[PDB]
Design a protein around this motif. Structure first.
Motif, short mmCIF file in Angstrom:
data_model
loop_
_atom_site.label_atom_id
_atom_site.label_comp_id
_atom_site.label_asym_id
_atom_site.label_seq_id
_atom_site.Cartn_x
_atom_site.Cartn_y
_atom_site.Cartn_z
N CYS A 197 32.27 53.34 44.73
CA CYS A 197 31.79 51.96 44.63
C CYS A 197 30.36 51.75 45.11
CB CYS A 197 32.71 51.03 45.42
SG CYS A 197 33.04 51.72 47.05
N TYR A 255 29.24 55.56 50.16
CA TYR A 255 28.61 56.72 50.81
C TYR A 255 28.02 57.64 49.74
CZ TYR A 255 31.64 55.08 54.67
OH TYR A 255 32.30 54.31 55.61
N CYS A 261 36.62 51.87 48.59
CA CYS A 261 37.10 52.35 47.29
C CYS A 261 38.05 53.54 47.37
CB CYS A 261 35.92 52.70 46.39
SG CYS A 261 34.73 53.81 47.17
ZN LIG Z 1 32.95 53.61 48.73
#
Ligand SMILES: [Zn+2]
Lengths: 96, 243, 144, 49, 98, 346, 90
Positions: C58, C61, C74
């Motif tokens: 999403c 990281y 996510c």
């Molecule tokens: Zn994420």
DNA sequence: TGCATCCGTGAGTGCAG
DNA sequence: TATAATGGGAGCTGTCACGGATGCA
């Protein structure tokens, strides 16, 4: 195919040829760095443009597909060392 | 009965009589393998050689399981596995359109039936219905794995092309073995029309120079530096990319 | 160590589970609008792998130092997209089902291992006959 | 031949709408879906052997 | 510009050029992805005074061992009369070589 | 041997009801539902939690699963345990255990008794993305709806009411599983609206319509642009094994290059960058090629604006944005002798 | 052969063929097909009352063969190779 | 018991396609 | 969500040869 900018199919019958000559390293080459040994393939072309001899190869990627495709049929194929304990040809990327 | 105020009893037993892989996983689970060995040899002693023959065939399969450590029941999956996505991709081809493996449409096919059965269970439906969902469930899993082996083959709509099931991938002249393991395509290779050169010595051949370049392109990039028809190898490549 | 043999053998249900990274619950591929993978269906990244190397699904990281944290928002690992090639999923079946190889590969391996006719195994499996496991004394036309 | 197979498919598509949808407010115009025909012809010429 | 000295304002080779392997026949630009410049790259540009560009060279070049003399071109957009192409395609350009 | 003709046989087994048996079974069900909430206000356990326990014993223990939505995992201990504080009741209250059990059993014979009907509806819904059977189950699936929502008191034959829920669930499955890429049912809904109105346009035109001639007959809020992008998602994907040629030794998927994985030209390129850039950090300074070597990252990148740059660099905040400038500045004259970085912009 | 359709009944009167919306060469360029529109006149008649409606409904485009024996199909010429087969009979 | 009889499996290489 | 409606539908064809597993005088 010429239009895709192909590779030349080195078939069962061509492999036999090299086999009968005993060109193990020339055949292996065909079966790893020249086809789908993604690791040693990338590794090689870097070796040429750097003026170095090509590096000994690792497991072809198409064999991995052969493992995973036998799991999808519920069969547990397993690379093993001489003392019978498994060997991860996926370098831990499919263990938890 | 509350109108006749009688308690009726209909003549019928608590019999345990099942259907399908649900049954067999039991019967396989209730197999003391050592026992059946004992009987089969204890019958390998028989004459007429026809009983002696099939207690061998059968016994072979017992020891096959005994010697290996597999459990017979394991030939019935509860958890069917799924093959990583990249090995059965969904791709946008040039026109922004998508091309997809046959397996997804086989999985989907099976995932519906398992799902719609998980529902038919909780909503308590008659056997005659839950039966049909289970049947349809094998034929799902039986086509994912070896489509066409049993019964009709699973056809996408509007064509008659059997879908390509897991076994179909593995096997055949076009399968994974004979087409990608016993010989692949290769880099550093070319093709062309041949032509007699009677001026050659035995150990020689006429390689046109346009082919030569490519088949040695790495080597030519490195050399191209060691003399200096380019500063570094990356610029060296951009030279030879237009004629 | 160095490969020297190659063993092939049956995967127990619990073992199939051993490999798996998530029950594919939905028959969905990828979102007809974002052209990205619907979660819990056949291409979900919280199961199989990040779609872009060391980048969470999403935004969370997005590079090598965070290597192996399943982001919370996510739920996708932070490794090389090359794992979408190796990480098995599993479908978790409602009623057990037979592996057709061990059924229809003549002579049957389930059919000889239980003295079951070719055509019996079909009936009992494709639901054309019951198969009594405990008759609780039942009796039919004058025979237990 | 390929035409006689498009025609017969169109006839699975009329009678279907001859016994479901309204058995008196109907014309030829809206009882015929030309597509089963259009397709078997597109087929013959674009992927026959 | 040498690498474009035969293309018209729009990105078509001029009818009557000579084209050889490597040569652009029709320039084209597609937008880059979520690999829009990564760190390694966002820095290399940081030194050269040009920032990362947002479009991409997808020009139609000529294949290895092909070529000749552009004899015609056909450019079909949509928004022009008589013409309507498969969904989602703006424009389709064909260049016949001899 | 053929999986339809088989189901067609199991169905030919349960005979067709008659008008009395229709109302009798219909009747016994409605009472048994009433009987359950009456039977839940006496005990206060829970309507559903109870109904499942009535269901368990009537159908046999052949089946049982923790029904998601009930709060206890319905293992045959809590069925004996709860069939007990149930059968523990006074004949004028445990009156209604007898009522539910009888009604659940009418449910069964009313579903099983009307399976033929579903057959002859799903029969008409073939060639639509779903297998006959697949349509049947979806059909029956609705039929289950129809009993739990019938009202015999309305004096209707059961056919008439079910022939709604049946074709409501066929049409829902025909619109929720058919496509490899699932699309919301309401978007499917309007897609067919093009397909149908385009078809009449063509049947009036002697030719297929244009995008525009569609947005007109489609009405307001419909332009040529929006009929286009509607089609370009109607577009079903194509098989990677779609056969190539008229022998078959080729697959349309083989002519498709894998552009995700880095080519060897490529992955070689990245290594002679991320090192011939380490070949311009420690060439003029390695701590001003470390404070700018953390104004980005050799892997992961390190770039925000002004906040961690103010935390642990060694120096003050707008002073690293200066040796950031002399970092870069040293590199633009650094790379006027080792000119082997231009070539990386291609 | 296929007509008439049966229980309502729908019977076949006659077909017609119109000239092509584009001339041979125009289809070669625009990757079209050299085809003619196919109209077929029908009459619906009610199996119970005596209903009479009669439209000529449009069936699609039948592709046309050029002067030399070829066809144009999405703007490439093609040939239809006659096929040999065992013949009907006893 | 010996022998019909059925079912499942194979059926050359690479290249253009 | 309510007239009533209650068991499908296309088969496809001109090869061959061997080996194994099943049925039957
Ligand atoms: Zn994420």
């Amino acid at each position: 195919g010429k239009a895709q900018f192909g590779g030349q199919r080195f078939g069962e019958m061509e492999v036999w040829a090299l086999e009968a000559y005993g060109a193990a390293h020339t055949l292996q080459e065909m079966l790893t760095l020249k086809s789908d040994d993604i690791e040693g393939r990338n590794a090689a072309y870097e070796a040429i443009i750097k003026g170095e001899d090509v590096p000994e190869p690792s497991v072809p990627e198409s064999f991995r597909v052969l493992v995973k495709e036998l799991q999808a049929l519920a069969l547990d194929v397993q690379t093993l060392d001489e003392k019978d304990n498994p060997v991860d040809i996926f370098e831990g990327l499919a263990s938890k | 009965d509350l109108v006749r105020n009688v308690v009726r009893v209909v003549e019928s037993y608590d019999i345990d009589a099942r259907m399908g892989a649900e049954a067999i996983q039991q019967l396989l689970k209730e197999l003391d393998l050592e026992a059946l060995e004992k009987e089969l040899l204890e019958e390998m002693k028989h004459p007429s050689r026809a009983r002696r023959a099939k207690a061998r065939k059968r016994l072979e399969v017992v020891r096959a399981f005994l010697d290996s450590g597999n459990r017979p029941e394991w030939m019935i999956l509860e958890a069917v596995p799924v093959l990583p996505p990249d090995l059965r991709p969904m791709v946008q081809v040039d026109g922004g359109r998508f091309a997809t493996s046959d397996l997804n449409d086989l999985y989907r096919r099976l995932i519906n039936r398992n799902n719609r059965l998980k529902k038919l269970l909780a909503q308590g439906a008659p056997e005659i219905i839950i039966r049909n969902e289970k049947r349809m469930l094998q034929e799902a899993v039986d086509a994912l794995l070896d489509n066409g082996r049993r019964g009709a083959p699973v056809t996408n709509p509007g064509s008659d092309r059997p879908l390509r099931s897991l076994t179909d991938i593995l096997s055949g002249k076009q399968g994974r073995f004979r087409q990608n393991l016993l010989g692949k395509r290769v880099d550093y290779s070319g093709r062309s029309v041949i032509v007699v050169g009677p001026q050659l010595k035995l150990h020689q051949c006429g390689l046109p120079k346009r082919m030569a370049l490519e088949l040695f392109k790495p080597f030519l990039l490195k050399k191209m530096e060691e003399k200096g028809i380019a500063p570094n190898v990356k610029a060296a490549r951009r030279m030879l990319e237009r004629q | 160590k160095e490969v020297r043999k190659v063993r092939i053998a049956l995967a127990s249900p619990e073992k199939i589970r051993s490999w798996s990274y998530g029950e594919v619950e939905k028959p969905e591929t990828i979102n007809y609008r974002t052209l990205k993978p619907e979660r819990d269906g056949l291409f979900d990244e919280r199961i199989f792998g990040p779609i872009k190397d060391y980048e969470c699904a999403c935004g969370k990281y997005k590079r090598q130092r965070f290597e192996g944290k399943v982001c919370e928002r996510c739920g996708v690992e932070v490794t090389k997209s090359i794992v979408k090639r190796y990480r098995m999923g599993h479908i978790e079946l409602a009623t057990p089902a037979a592996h057709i190889w061990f059924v229809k590969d003549v002579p049957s391996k389930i059919g000889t291992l239980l003295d079951l006719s070719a055509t019996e195994l079909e009936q009992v499996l494709y639901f054309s006959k019951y198969i009594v496991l405990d008759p609780k004394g039942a009796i039919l036309n004058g025979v237990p | 031949d390929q035409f006689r197979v498009g025609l017969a498919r169109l006839a699975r598509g009329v009678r279907e709408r001859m016994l479901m949808g309204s058995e008196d407010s109907l014309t030829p115009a809206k009882l015929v879906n030309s597509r089963p025909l259009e397709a078997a012809i597109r087929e013959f010429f674009s992927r026959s052997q | 510009e040498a690498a474009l000295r035969d293309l018209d304002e729009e990105g078509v080779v001029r009818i009557g050029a000579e084209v050889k392997p490597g040569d652009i026949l029709v320039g084209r630009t597609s937008f880059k992805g979520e690999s829009e410049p990564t760190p390694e790259e966002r820095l290399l540009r940081s030194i050269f005074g040009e920032k990362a560009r947002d479009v991409k060279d997808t020009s139609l070049r000529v294949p290895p061992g092909e070529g000749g003399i552009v004899v015609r071109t056909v450019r079909l957009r949509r928004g022009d009369p008589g013409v309507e192409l498969k969904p989602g395609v703006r424009e389709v350009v064909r260049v016949y070589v001899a | 041997s053929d999986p339809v003709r088989q189901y067609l046989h199991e169905i030919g087994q349960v005979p067709l009801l008659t008008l009395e048996e229709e109302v009798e079974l219909a009747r016994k069900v409605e009472e048994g539902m009433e009987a359950i909430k009456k039977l839940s206000e006496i005990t206060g356990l829970d309507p559903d939690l109870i109904r499942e326990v009535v269901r368990a014993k009537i159908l046999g223990s052949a089946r049982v699963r923790h029904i998601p939505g009930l709060k206890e995992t319905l293992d045959p201990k809590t069925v004996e345990e709860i069939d007990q504080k149930l059968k523990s009741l006074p004949k004028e209250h445990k009156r209604y255990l007898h009522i539910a059990r009888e009604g659940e059993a009418a449910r069964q014979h009313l579903i099983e008794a009307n399976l033929r009907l579903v057959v002859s509806i799903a029969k008409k819904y073939t060639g639509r993305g779903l297998s006959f059977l697949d349509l049947i189950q979806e059909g029956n699936q609705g039929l289950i709806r129809a009993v739990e929502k019938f009202e015999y008191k309305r004096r209707f034959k059961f056919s008439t009411y079910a022939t709604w829920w049946i074709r409501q669930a066929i049409n829902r499955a025909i619109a929720d599983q058919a496509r490899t890429i699932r699309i919301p049912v309401h978007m499917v809904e309007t897609i067919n609206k093009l397909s149908r109105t385009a078809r009449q346009l063509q049947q009036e035109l002697g030719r297929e319509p244009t995008y525009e001639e569609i947005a007109e007959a489609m009405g307001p809020g419909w332009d040529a642009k929006r009929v286009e992008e509607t089609l370009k998602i109607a577009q079903e994907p194509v098989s990677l094994e779609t056969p190539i040629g008229d022998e078959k030794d080729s697959f349309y998927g083989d002519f498709i290059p894998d552009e995700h994985l880095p080519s060897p030209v490529d992955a070689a390129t990245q290594s002679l960058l991320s090192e011939e850039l380490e070949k311009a950090l420690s060439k003029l300074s390695e701590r001003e090629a470390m404070v700018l070597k953390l104004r980005k990252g050799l892997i992961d990148g390190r770039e925000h604006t002004l906040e961690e740059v103010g935390a642990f660099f060694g120096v003050t905040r707008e002073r690293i944005r200066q040796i950031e400038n002399k970092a870069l500045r040293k590199l633009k004259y650094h790379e006027s002798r080792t000119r082997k970085l231009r070539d990386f912009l291609d | 052969e296929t007509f008439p359709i049966e229980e309502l009944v729908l019977d076949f009167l006659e077909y017609r063929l119109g000239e092509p919306p584009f001339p041979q060469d125009e289809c070669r360029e625009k990757d079209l097909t050299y085809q003619a529109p196919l109209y077929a006149r029908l009459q619906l008649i009610h199996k119970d009352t005596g209903l009479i409606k009669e439209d000529e409904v449009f069936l699609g485009h039948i592709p046309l063969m050029t002067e030399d024996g070829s066809f144009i199909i999405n703007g490439a010429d093609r040939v239809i190779v006659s096929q040999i087969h065992r013949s009907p009979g006893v």
